[PDB]
Amino acid sequence: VTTATLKRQLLQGILQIDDTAADVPVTYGEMVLQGTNLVTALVMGKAV
Amino acid sequence: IAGLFNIPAGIIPTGNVLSTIEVCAHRCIFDFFKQIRSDDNSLYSAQFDILLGTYCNTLNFVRFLELGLSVACICTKFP
């Protein structure tokens, strides 16, 4: 996060821009879990 | 007595207290009492240490059998 004037001066003097596209993720990361496994683990104590 | 995920409270009672005696009587080691009418609330509650995947560090496999030593010094074997 830089100042607009500072980044403009940098890109005009030294830095160069050679980008035209971007990356967009295609995974929502939505998942669900069943409480039966948790119940069985709790009622057993030790499990693998 | 309390302070764990579950409270067995000793053994599971077989219905109600027999011998026609009070559930409290004399408080010696037991002091918690709770009577319910029909079921209970907070039916969705548990505690477990879940873990997805075993994270570990990565170390490069480097041995003494490298060409650098052979090209820097004289390499010979005397078994």
Size of interface A-B (CB pairs under 8 A): 11
Closest Cα in chain A, distance from residue B31 (Å): 25
| DSSP 8-state symbol, B51 | -
Quote the distance between the C-alpha of residue A6 and its chain's center: 28
Integer Cα distance of B14 and B11 in angstroms: 9
Integer Cα distance of A38 and B47 in angstroms: 8
Integer Cα distance of B30 and B8 in angstroms: 12
- Technique used: cryo-EM
| DSSP 8-state symbol, A20 | -
CA distances from B13 to A43, B16, B33, B35, B72 (A): 18, 7, 13, 13, 81
Cβ-based contacts of A42 with chain B (< 8 Å): 5-6, 46-48
Number of H helices, E strands in chain A: 2, 0
Q: Which of A31, A37, A42, A48 to mutate to test the interface with B (most CBs of B within 10 A)?
A: A42
Integer Cα distance of A43 and B6 in angstroms: 9
CA distances from A15 to A1, A3, A6 (A): 16, 15, 11
Chain A CB within 8 Å of residue B48 CB: yes
Resolution of this entry, Å: 8.3
Nearest CA in chain A to B48: A38
Contact B73, B66 (CB under 8 A): no
